[PDB]
């Protein structure tokens, strides 16, 4: 009845608890690529949010959004909880066939902060695949006017890790979604 | 096209008698709203808890957040993006050629911070007007 398992958690990024710009690297620089503002959560707390919405007009790109360096610690095996919204495709105005309702996550260790805005190759290998994420939840907005929907969360397993550090990222191939957080931490 | 910040304290001489503060904001743009540190030159950290209203809810000066600013070691910041469709489910989300509100109704002091009603907004003008598009 009364056994415990007591396992601390210790982060390593949490955006949620930043108050000023996450100033994230993001490829290609063009109009349609990820883009950092404020927003409310289901906390409804202000925190530092990435959007991407660029459904009929993407023609075969790819935008991706990595973080920052973030030392591993001591960890080896990281954990990554992401919160976000993602739109119903066939419920926006003027999206393409590009729509998606879906997005992949990769990982990229390094001993030092080397990647610049144009290195390492924004593609799988150097990059590592951790899972292409789904919406158990779409959301559904008319613009100015009304919103329903419900946050989505999924956590992600990474590893094991070696380096002194790691990026991650995220590929959109033609979602509408907002990430409104993202949480790795290791368990001790 | 990121816009000046706006440092949101009593300091700040942009609020200005009456009118407030007006702003002409154009799609696609962005702009920080700052709530300052007390630092090692300033005595008197300034309570808001700032929020988007709609004019008759800005007329005059009643609420029912975009920043709260009650921590002094701290520069606190809101930046909004201009953009007529978010996919945040709370996404700010804007017209061209259409008119929006920030105000904060707490009187500058922890005490007050909350207050629903009064300000700031009544008192010293706090208030901004985006004349979007």
């Known amino acids: 009845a009364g056994h415990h398992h007591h396992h601390h958690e210790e ?18 620089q063009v109009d349609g690529q990820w ?3 404020s927003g409310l959560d289901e906390e409804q ?9 660029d ?3 993407a023609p075969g790109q790819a935008h991706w959004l990595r973080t920052g360096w973030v030392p591993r610690r001591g960890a080896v095996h990281v954990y990554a909880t992401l919160r976000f919204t993602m739109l119903e495709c066939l419920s926006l105005p003027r999206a393409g066939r590009s729509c ?3 997005f ?3 990982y990229y260790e390094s001993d030092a902060d080397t990647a610049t805005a144009l290195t390492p190759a924004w593609m799988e290998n150097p990059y590592i695949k951790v899972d292409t994420v789904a919406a158990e939840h779409l959301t559904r907005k008319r613009p ?3 919103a329903t929907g419900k946050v989505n969360v999924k956590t992600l397993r990474l590893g094991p890790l070696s380096k002194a550090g790691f990026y991650l990222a995220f590929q959109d191939q033609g979602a509408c979604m907002a990430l409104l957080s993202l949480h790795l931490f290791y368990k001790k | 096209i990121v816009l000046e910040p706006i440092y949101w304290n009593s300091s700040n001489s942009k609020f200005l008698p009456g009118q407030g503060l007006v702003l002409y904001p154009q799609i696609g743009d962005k702009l920080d709203i700052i709530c300052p540190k007390v630092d ?13 209203v709609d004019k008759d809810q800005a007329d005059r000066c009643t609420i029912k957040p975009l920043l709260n600013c009650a921590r002094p070691d701290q520069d606190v910041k809101f930046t909004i993006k201009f953009q007529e469709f978010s996919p945040n489910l709370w996404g700010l989300e804007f017209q061209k050629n259409k008119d929006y509100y920030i105000i904060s109704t707490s009187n500058g002091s922890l005490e007050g911070l909350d207050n629903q009603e009064g300000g700031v907004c009544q008192t010293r003008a706090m208030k901004i007007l985006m004349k979007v598009g």
């Open chain 1, 144 to 146: 100015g006017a009304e």
């Open chain 1, 35 to 37: 883009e950092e503002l």
């Open chain 1, 100 to 102: 998606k309702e879906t």
């Open chain 1, 45 to 53: 707390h202000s925190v530092r949010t990435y959007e991407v919405c």
């Open chain 2, 40 to 52: 090692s030159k300033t005595v008197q950290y300034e309570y808001y808890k700032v929020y988007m």
């Open chain 1, 11 to 28: 982060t390593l990024l949490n955006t949620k608890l930043e108050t000023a710009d996450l100033k994230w690297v993001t490829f290609p």
């Open chain 1, 104 to 106: 992949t996550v990769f």
């Open chain 1, 55 to 57: 459904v009929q007009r």
